[PDB]
Design a protein around this ligand. Structure first.
Ligand SMILES: O=P(O)(O)OC[C@H]1O[C@@H](O)[C@H](O)[C@@H](O)[C@H]1O
Lengths: 474, 474
């Protein structure tokens, strides 16, 4: 006897500003770090970038009309900081705020709840130039000024807010793997920038309690739950290390204001632990979120990794299956193909039960409500003549994950909503346009913008029926 | 680089009153539930009982002398409730208090730290007769009065106190499996008596803060960390359920004062959740321990168990390897032999890495210091000519486990000490005398009581050398 989805369950879809808006230099918008980075040769798939993306900036009315047709209860989007402060921390660009005001008014006029993401990796380039952006404590008050600007302008109309989207990704990709701006490969700098982002997160949550006393706020963590390969004790210990280093390192700080101790000591032993200032722990412990935001796509299985073992592996950014290779931390753990699940063409594991496990782990460890801020299937789509897209593979993926959400709710996890990535097709920062996630196909590819026309996929009508039945009919 | 064991690490050994003392009816001692239960035919191995045990009650001076020869830093023993209150409540028996006074003086006069366990399974039969012992809230104030009596008489000389030893064992065995007093097979009653035991533990810890303000106290949990069989999502989920149901169910209450929510929901859905009265949560959440006590012998590997699957299985009280079979809870998990570790003749997993994992899990989840109150190998010993007991198998087990403790300490776990089970051979209620745990052989078996003379085993001299080098030489 499964519990039903609660009556006000937030059935949503999501996007991010750099990935969907376009209009990169219009109406006073400044450069973001992604404007600059993506135009460096070799940084993005086929040199794709967000100059135009899918032009949501100009076409938001058509897109919101499609959301209304679907019956979306919630739409999660991010605000482009460089539209609001073109130089990051100077005078406000009113035309920038006005875009998001028009967007929010469009959502509310169709009965859709806005979910505002403050930060989706696009800090203005001017802050990188002035002081290195997230690597400097100066960003704490600059991010707070920006957050409070949005809180005051939109807090009367927006109840649900996300602070940092996938801090573990934009920090580790920007400072350990060098795949995001600023392109650094330095573990000491990574953990320093990470600590500053933790403090910025806490500061803005503190501010939120003053400026939006009846709102709900949380970070959105890129959560891949770890599995041991088998019951060999060394592999279970590898799993303990992996879960703590990859997941508790972030979520313990979000929930408890404390880093986990075994991980801290391993970094201390390598001279990698971040610099801690007086007041840091007090701020991190005082900023309790209303929920843990969860971006979930796949689990990760790990096994023992000797001290001279595997480090950085090969990442699949082309969609040729089976091209990724194991990665890990020497002495702690390394990843291994999970033989009991299938994978996508980008080698992401398809593990709906892993979402139930992840939701249970967060509830069991932190007792926090969860907002699923991202989940979806990135795959090639074929436009068939007559403007038909039969993405049964995407329906099957979403269906099985939504079913496991219902089992977690029945277990006692307080799930507040589910936001599918993505509403329309959009730019994947590192994979181009052909790794599509949308309910709505956009007619363009990596070589041509074509006409950017919106075409409803079969998954569009499937999710429409999920929402109409409140998830009773999947 | 391994860290050294800290300078004041408590190198110890342990026993339990009913298993070691004898003198079951001397100096006004009342009958305990074990006095009565072990005399019923078929309850214990070959009808062995603790009428004489190894007669430590009359030979404690000899046993403490052997401790001083070995160089024990600490000795963990339990106090017999029926020696102190033959009735459970009512008049204190001064000759009962006087025995533990003489014991504690003997330990202190040889520079050995006493660790007093308040309760090891032997509630006076009178309380079982009057109101069902642990199934009644009356036991909360009666246990408290007993504990406070011990705090007042010995608080000045005893710093380390253990409240309930293996609450999960004497509750589950006594009310689910029917193998311990009172021999019940009723899960509803088990969870009621468990809840009262939780309240009793909390009340005594609160009293402890008043009466022994400079002491350290905690429960000692029988911890078998759970492993998933493999990375099949359904088997990881079985591991989440097993770890929560078998371990978090107790340790979450000890550390946070809360039951885990999914396990609670499962029990409530079966009409098995305990009765909560006003003020239960407040008391349980106020009673933070100074440490988590850990009795570790083995890990458990689990796998998926369908709704129509395995329940209770066969236990090995014989010593014939391969007799035990799988057990579990239908729909949640069932146990499976771990193909990657060896096992004893009683089918217990030999998994020293499992101890490090369990220590890491407790530190990672609760951030508590750990006192390892029990660890040992139960095996057959042969007395060879020349008073030689070559228990190399026992040395091998202990050495590997101590080595993993050192790695846990190096990882950052705060391990306060290590109490091997047991100092002398003693009585196993369900396994008899031939499953020996001691550093010191005791001359008796299940048939012949002989003279009970003490003989130092090879492992006695090994551990003497461990303590002498503070663990540098294993
Ligand atoms: O585009 P990707 O890398 O395939 O992932 C799909 C999406 O989910 C997460 O990674 C991010 O929050 C988004 O920026 C987007 O990347």
């Amino acid at each position: 006897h499964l519990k039903p989805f609660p009556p006000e369950f937030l059935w949503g879809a999501a996007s991010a500003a750099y990935q969907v808006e376009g209009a990169w230099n219009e109406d006073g918008k400044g450069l973001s770090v992604w404007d600059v980075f993506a135009k460096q040769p070799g940084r993005t798939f086929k040199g794709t970038n967000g100059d135009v993306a899918v032009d949501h900036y100009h076409r938001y009315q058509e897109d919101v009309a499609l959301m209304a047709e679907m019956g979306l209860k919630a739409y999660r989007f991010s605000v482009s900081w460089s539209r609001v402060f073109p130089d990051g921390n100077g005078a406000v660009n009113e035309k920038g705020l006005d875009f998001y005001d028009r967007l929010i008014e469009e959502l509310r006029n169709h009965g859709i709840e806005p979910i505002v993401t403050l930060y989706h990796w696009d800090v203005p380039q001017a802050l990188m130039d002035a002081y290195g952006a997230w690597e400097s404590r100066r960003i704490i008050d600059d991010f707070d000024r920006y957050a409070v600007t949005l809180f005051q302008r939109f807090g009367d109309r927006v109840k649900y807010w996300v602070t940092l989207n996938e801090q573990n990704i934009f920090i580790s990709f920007g400072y350990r793997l060098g795949l995001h701006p600023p392109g650094v490969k330095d573990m000491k700098r990574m953990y320093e920038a990470n600590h500053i982002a933790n403090l910025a997160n806490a500061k803005v949550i503190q501010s939120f309690r003053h400026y939006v006393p009846d709102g709900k706020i949380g970070p959105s963590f890129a959560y891949s739950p770890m599995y041991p390969y088998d019951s060999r004790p060394e592999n279970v210990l590898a799993f303990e290390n992996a879960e703590e280093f990859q997941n508790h390192w972030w979520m313990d700080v979000y929930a408890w204001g404390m880093y986990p101790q075994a991980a801290w000591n391993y970094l201390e032993s390598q001279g990698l632990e971040p610099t801690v200032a007086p007041g840091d722990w007090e701020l991190l412990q005082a900023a309790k979120p209303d929920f843990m935001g969860v971006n979930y796509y796949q689990t990760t299985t790990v096994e023992h990794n000797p001290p001279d073992g595997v480090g950085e592996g090969v990442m699949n950014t082309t969609g040729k299956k089976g091209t990724s290779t194991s990665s890990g931390i020497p002495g702690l753990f390394k990843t291994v193909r999970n033989p009991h699940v299938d994978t996508t063409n980008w080698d992401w594991a398809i593990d709906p039960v892993g979402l139930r496990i992840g939701l249970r782990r967060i509830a069991n460890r932190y007792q926090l409500p969860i907002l699923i801020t991202e989940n979806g299937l990135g795959e090639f789509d074929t436009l068939e003549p007559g403007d038909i897209v039969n993405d049964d593979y995407r329906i099957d993926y979403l269906r099985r994950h939504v079913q496991e959400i219902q089992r977690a709710i029945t277990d006692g996890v307080d799930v507040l909503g589910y936001c599918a990535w993505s509403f329309t097709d959009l730019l994947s920062a590192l994979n181009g346009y052909q790794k599509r996630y949308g309910f709505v196909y956009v007619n363009r590819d990596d070589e041509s913008e074509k006409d950017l026309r919106r075409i409803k996929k079969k998954s569009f009508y499937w999710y429409q029926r999920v929402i109409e039945t409140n998830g009773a009919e999947l």
